[PDB]
C-alpha cells in the first residue's frame, strides 16, 4: 500500500498547517503501478527544473502513455478500475510532492472524458481517438496559448530594455529567447535566486547558451542592483479568485521593491492556472519541504561538508524551516497575459466564469 507516518525533524511550534514528510528510496509498494508514474514521483521529489507549467505537461504525457498501454479487461469494463488506479496515482503524487493547480484541472478534464465515453464502442477505436483529443487539448491550452502569450508580451515590452526575473518558468524562458533571437533587441536580463534550489541559475545557464547579457544575483543583494530596472517578470503558479499571486519563493520581495521603486510588475499566466480556491497570506496553505536541502553550505547542490550544522532532532529547539510557495500581495502586480489576451489582476475571475 505504501509508507505512512514517522517524520524527520521536530513537529515545530510555529507553522504546522501542512504535511512535512513519503517515499524517496523505494521500499514496500504495490506491484501494479505504472513505472512512468514511479519515475515522475522520483523526479519531482528532488527536482530542480520544473515550476508549475512543465509539471502538468509531464503529467499529461504520462497519462497518454498509460492509455496507450491500457487494454480493457474482458470481464470488467473501462470505467471500473481505471478511476481507482488514477486515485492511486494522485495519492502517490501527493506523497511525493503536493500537486499544482494546473494538474488538478487536467485530472478534472480526464475524469470528465471518462464519463463522456460509454463502454459500448470497441476498445482500440476508443483509445485511438482519446489520445488524439488529449494531444489537441495540450496543443490548444498549452502550446498555442503559450505562443499567444509570447506575442502579447512582444507588443508590451519596449525596444532596448532591462528585465529582472525570477524562477524557472517555461513561459518566460521562451519569452526571453524570443526577445534575443527572433526580435533582436538590447535586452539586459538579470536573474535572481534563493537557497533551497537554483532555479534562476538554470535559467541563466540556458540564456547564456543562447548568448544573452546576463547578470546573476541574490535576494540579499537587491537594494544595489536596482540602483536600471524597467520590467519585472514573475513565474506564475496560481492566481486565485481574490487576485492574489500564489507563486514561488523570492517573488513578493521583488514585487514590493518594484512597486516602491516606481517600475511595474508583469506576470505571464495560463488559462489553466486559475483556481476558485481563496487565501490572503503565506501561512494559509504552504508547500513545505524537508530541511535536508538546506543542511549543506550551498555553492552548487551536492558538496558534502563537515560544517557547522548537522543536528535537527537532538537539538533543543532549532527550527531551520523554509517555505517554497509563497504569496504576493494583490495591488502590486499590474499586467496578466493569458488565452484571453490581457486583463489586470483585480479582474481575476473573468476566466473562471468564462470557462
Amino acid at each position: 500500500p505504501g509508507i505512512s507516518s514517522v517524520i524527520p525533524t521536530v513537529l515545530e511550534q510555529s507553522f504546522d498547517n501542512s504535511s512535512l514528510i513519503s517515499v524517496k528510496e523505494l521500499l514496500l509498494n504495490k506491484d501494479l503501478i505504472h513505472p512512468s508514474i514511479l519515475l515522475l514521483t522520483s523526479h519531482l521529489a528532488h527536482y530542480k527544473i520544473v515550476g508549475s507549467i512543465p509539471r502538468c505537461i509531464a503529467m499529461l504525457e504520462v497519462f497518454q502513455i498509460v492509455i496507450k498501454d491500457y487494454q480493457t479487461p474482458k470481464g470488467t469494463t473501462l470505467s471500473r478500475n481505471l478511476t481507482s488506479y488514477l486515485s492511486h496515482q494522485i495519492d502517490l503524487l501527493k506523497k511525493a510532492r503536493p500537486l499544482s493547480v494546473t494538474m488538478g484541472n487536467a485530472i478534472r478534464w480526464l475524469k470528465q472524458e471518462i464519463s463522456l465515453i460509454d463502454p459500448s464502442t470497441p476498445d482500440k477505436a476508443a483509445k485511438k481517438d482519446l489520445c488524439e483529443k488529449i494531444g489537441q487539448f495540450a496543443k490548444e491550452k498549452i502550446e498555442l496559448a503559450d505562443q499567444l502569450i509570447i506575442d502579447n508580451a512582444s507588443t508590451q515590452i519596449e525596444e532596448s530594455t532591462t528585465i529582472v526575473t525570477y524562477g524557472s518558468s517555461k513561459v518566460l524562458t521562451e519569452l526571453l529567447l524570443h526577445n534575443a533571437i527572433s526580435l533582436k533587441k538590447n535586452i539586459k536580463v538579470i536573474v535572481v535566486d534563493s537557497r533551497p534550489l537554483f532555479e534562476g541559475r538554470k535559467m541563466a545557464e540556458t540564456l547564456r547558451n543562447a548568448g544573452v547579457n546576463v547578470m546573476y544575483a541574490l535576494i540579499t543583494s537587491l537594494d544595489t542592483i536596482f540602483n536600471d530596472v524597467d520590467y519585472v517578470f514573475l513565474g506564475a503558479h496560481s492566481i486565485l479568485s481574490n487576485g492574489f499571486l500564489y507563486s514561488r519563493a523570492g517573488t513578493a520581495m521583488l514585487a514590493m521593491s518594484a512597486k516602491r521603486r516606481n517600475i511595474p510588475v508583469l506576470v505571464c499566466c495560463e488559462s489553466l492556472k486559475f483556481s476558485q480556491r481563496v487565501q490572503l497570506d503565506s501561512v494559509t496553505f504552504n508547500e513545505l519541504a524537508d530541511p535536508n536541502d538546506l543542511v549543506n553550505i550551498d555553492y552548487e547542490n551536492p558538496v558534502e561538508r563537515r560544517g557547522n550544522k548537522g543536528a535537527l532532532l537532538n537539538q533543543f529547539i532549532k527550527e531551520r524551516k523554509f517555505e517554497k510557495k509563497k504569496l504576493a500581495m494583490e495591488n502590486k502586480p499590474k499586467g496578466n497575459k493569458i488565452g484571453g489576451k490581457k486583463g489586470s489582476e483585480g479582474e481575476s475571475k473573468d476566466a473562471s466564469n468564462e470557462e
Partner: protein, 302 residues
C-alpha cells in the same frame, strides 16, 4: 470620398456631435456608398481608411476606440444568418441612431450623476469632458448648492477655457494652479475628472496632470471622480506609469541653446493606476473597479 476631411469639417460645430460620435457617423457614410452587401470589398477598405486615420492622428486616442465598437456592431448584425438585405438596412440606419444615442445617454447620466454632489460641497474640477460639465449644469438646473475650484491645466490652456464656460452659467469660481493643487485638498470636498480614455486594467488615459491629482487625493483620502460617455474604452493596457501611444515626444532632452526655442517638451498625456479612482460614472449604470474590463470582455468575446 475621404473620412479625415469629413472630420476636419467639424470646426465651429462640436459640443452636440461628440468627437468619436462624429467619426462613427463618418464611418457609416463611407460604408453606405460602395455597397455593404460584399464583406471582402467593404470591410478591407474600411480597415484601410481607419489605418489612414490613425496615420493622420497627432494626439487623439478615442477615434481608435470608436472604430472598434462600430466594427463589432457590423459583425453582430448578421450573426443570426438573416436576410443579406434587412440586416444591411439596420446597419446603415444605426449611424444616425448611434448619434441619437449620445443624446439619450446624456439624458440618463445628468439625472443619475447629480446624486454624488451633496448639500453644499466644494468641488475641485479637472479636465473638460461633455459628461462632467453636463452634470454640473443640470445640478444648477436642479437648484443644488455647490462651489467650484478651477485647475490650471496646460495643454492648449484648458483652465481658462473651463473658467469662461463656468462664468456663462452662474456659479462662483477662482483660478487654482496645478503646482499649488496640493495646498487645496482640505477646503475641497470632492475631486472630479473627465477622461480621454479608460483602461482595460481600470486605470485612466488623461491630460497634462491627472495622475498627480490622483495620488495627492489618495494621500488626503478625499474622493476622486471619473465621469464620461460610454464609448471611450480601448483594448489598451499601459503597463508602466510613463508608456503611451505617441506621435511626438516621449521626454526629449535638448542641447545648449541661446536663442531659446527648444524647451516645452514634457509628457502631455499621463496614466494613473486603478487604485486612485474612487468612483466612475457612465450611462452603463453606476460602476467603477473591475467593471470596465467586464465591458471589454463582453464586447471583444475574448
Amino acid at each position: 470620398f475621404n473620412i479625415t476631411e469629413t472630420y476636419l469639417r467639424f470646426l465651429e460645430e462640436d459640443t452636440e456631435m461628440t468627437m468619436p460620435i462624429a467619426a462613427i457617423e463618418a464611418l457609416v457614410t463611407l460604408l453606405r456608398i460602395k455597397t455593404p452587401e460584399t464583406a471582402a470589398e467593404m470591410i478591407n477598405t474600411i480597415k484601410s481608411s481607419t489605418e489612414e486615420l490613425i496615420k493622420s492622428i497627432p494626439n487623439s486616442v478615442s477615434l481608435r476606440a470608436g472604430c472598434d465598437i462600430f466594427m463589432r456592431f457590423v459583425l453582430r448584425n448578421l450573426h443570426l444568418y438573416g436576410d443579406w438585405e434587412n440586416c444591411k438596412q439596420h446597419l446603415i440606419e444605426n449611424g444616425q441612431l448611434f448619434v441619437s444615442r449620445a443624446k439619450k445617454s446624456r439624458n440618463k447620466i445628468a439625472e443619475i450623476g447629480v446624486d454624488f454632489i451633496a448639500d453644499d460641497d466644494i468641488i475641485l474640477v479637472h479636465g473638460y469632458s461633455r459628461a462632467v460639465f453636463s452634470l454640473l449644469n443640470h445640478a444648477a438646473n436642479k437648484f443644488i448648492r455647490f462651489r467650484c475650484v478651477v485647475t490650471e491645466s496646460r495643454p492648449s490652456k484648458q483652465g481658462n477655457q473651463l473658467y469662461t464656460l463656468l462664468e456663462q452659467k452662474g456659479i462662483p469660481v477662482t483660478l487654482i494652479v496645478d503646482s499649488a493643487v496640493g495646498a487645496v485638498i482640505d477646503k475641497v470636498d470632492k475631486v472630479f475628472v473627465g477622461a480621454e480614455g479608460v483602461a482595460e486594467s481600470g486605470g485612466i488615459i488623461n491630460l497634462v496632470g491627472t495622475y498627480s491629482v490622483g495620488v495627492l487625493a489618495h494621500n488626503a483620502r478625499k474622493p476622486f471622480y471619473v465621469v464620461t460617455e460610454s464609448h471611450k474604452f480601448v483594448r489598451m493596457f499601459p503597463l508602466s506609469s510613463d508608456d503611451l501611444p505617441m506621435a511626438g515626444p516621449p521626454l526629449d532632452f535638448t542641447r545648449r541653446t541661446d536663442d531659446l526655442e527648444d524647451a516645452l517638451r514634457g509628457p502631455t498625456i499621463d496614466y494613473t493606476a486603478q487604485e486612485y479612482i474612487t468612483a466612475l460614472i457612465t450611462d452603463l449604470g453606476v460602476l467603477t473597479p473591475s467593471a470596465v474590463s467586464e465591458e471589454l470582455i463582453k464586447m471583444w468575446y475574448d
